[PDB]
Amino acid sequence: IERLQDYLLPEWVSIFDIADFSGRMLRIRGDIRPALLRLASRLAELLNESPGPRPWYPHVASHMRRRVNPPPETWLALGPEKRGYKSYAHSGVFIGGRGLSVRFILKDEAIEERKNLGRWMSRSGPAFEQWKKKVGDLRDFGPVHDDPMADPPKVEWDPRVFGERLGSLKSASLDIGFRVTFDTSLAGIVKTIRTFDLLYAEAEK
Ligand SMILES: [Cl-]
Ligand SMILES: [Cl-]
């Protein structure tokens, strides 16, 4: 049974205990990146075995923007475009000092897709709440973006107001999902990513 730890070694969480930029980046780029590329490819193959409402193409964080503060986490992204991913909805598998997580992301620069998903959330609060109940322990990673070891809070906001903000503010963003263990099967992770399909699809239009 293929598992996340076959790609991302459990001990790699300690890379994120390296406080200095150069030292942490060396390990993120040298050791974690090749593994994330392999894992991203494999997850995309598995997802594409049963097509969903949008394509999934693999990407890996480039870390070309950081200078002084090392990344608190690194990730692969699965999104609808072959090259680039930050301008569109995507799912990601992340590793940092806290371990692994699987999240659904709309960055501030995904202006149009935030407008689309925000409008859906605003108009479909009850459907969002139903979905949230079904997926269990949904966390908001937004508030802990500056607290790498902190347990992210449960999503408790009103999706209608959150959606209104997400759609209308240039600096708004979404980052929600699940903490997962290193021994989780790839088959289980694929299904977790599929549970974001409702949001992924509604972001497109
Ligand atoms: Cl992009
Ligand atoms: Cl599993």
Side-chain angles (χ1 to χ4, degrees):
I1 295 167
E2 275 200 282
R3 299 174 189 278
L4 287 173
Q5 61 193 14
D6 298 331
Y7 295 81
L8 304 179
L9 298 180
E11 298 73 21
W12 286 351
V13 297
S14 71
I15 284 164
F16 297 89
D17 300 338
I18 301 169
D20 53 292
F21 183 84
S22 296
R24 196 189 300 178
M25 279 294 340
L26 195 70
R27 304 297 307 285
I28 289 168
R29 175 168 290 176
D31 296 347
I32 307 181
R33 177 181 175 85
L36 286 167
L37 281 164
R38 291 180 255 129
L39 178 56
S41 182
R42 183 61 179 145
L43 292 172
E45 287 172 349
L46 291 168
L47 281 157
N48 286 128
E49 287 180 1
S50 292
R54 302 182 79 171
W56 296 277
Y57 291 98
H59 308 271
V60 177
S62 72
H63 305 299
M64 69 173 76
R65 296 194 192 188
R66 272 165 189 273
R67 308 274 171 259
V68 175
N69 305 124
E73 56 191 0
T74 187
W75 60 88
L76 65 89
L78 292 151
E81 297 292 326
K82 185 169 181 54
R83 298 201 308 155
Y85 70 92
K86 292 184 178 181
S87 294
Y88 309 92
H90 52 281
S91 291
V93 178
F94 292 75
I95 181 169
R98 200 169 39 214
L100 303 189
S101 53
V102 180
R103 288 129 66 175
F104 180 77
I105 312 291
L106 281 162
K107 294 180 174 177
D108 54 3
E109 64 185 284
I111 294 164
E112 296 302 322
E113 298 219 344
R114 287 190 294 107
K115 173 179 159 158
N116 297 158
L117 186 62
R119 178 137 170 88
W120 173 83
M121 288 175 88
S122 294
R123 296 235 256 139
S124 317
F128 181 88
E129 289 300 305
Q130 288 175 150
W131 174 80
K132 186 176 82 166
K133 178 199 167 192
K134 182 275 174 179
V135 299
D137 196 9
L138 186 70
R139 308 296 185 80
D140 188 353
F141 287 75
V144 294
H145 280 341
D146 283 338
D147 302 288
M149 292 301 290
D151 199 26
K154 289 173 164 289
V155 170
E156 297 291 354
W157 32 250
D158 184 346
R160 180 175 50 76
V161 173
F162 189 98
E164 186 179 7
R165 199 151 104 278
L166 184 68
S168 67
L169 297 178
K170 279 168 183 167
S171 65
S173 61
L174 179 66
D175 184 343
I176 55 171
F178 314 101
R179 296 186 62 187
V180 301
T181 58
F182 276 90
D183 66 5
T184 308
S185 70
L186 298 200
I189 297 297
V190 166
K191 285 149 79 176
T192 297
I193 291 162
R194 293 181 193 287
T195 71
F196 296 135
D197 274 347
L198 172 60
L199 310 179
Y200 194 41
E202 291 292 351
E204 186 178 13
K205 305 192 216 178

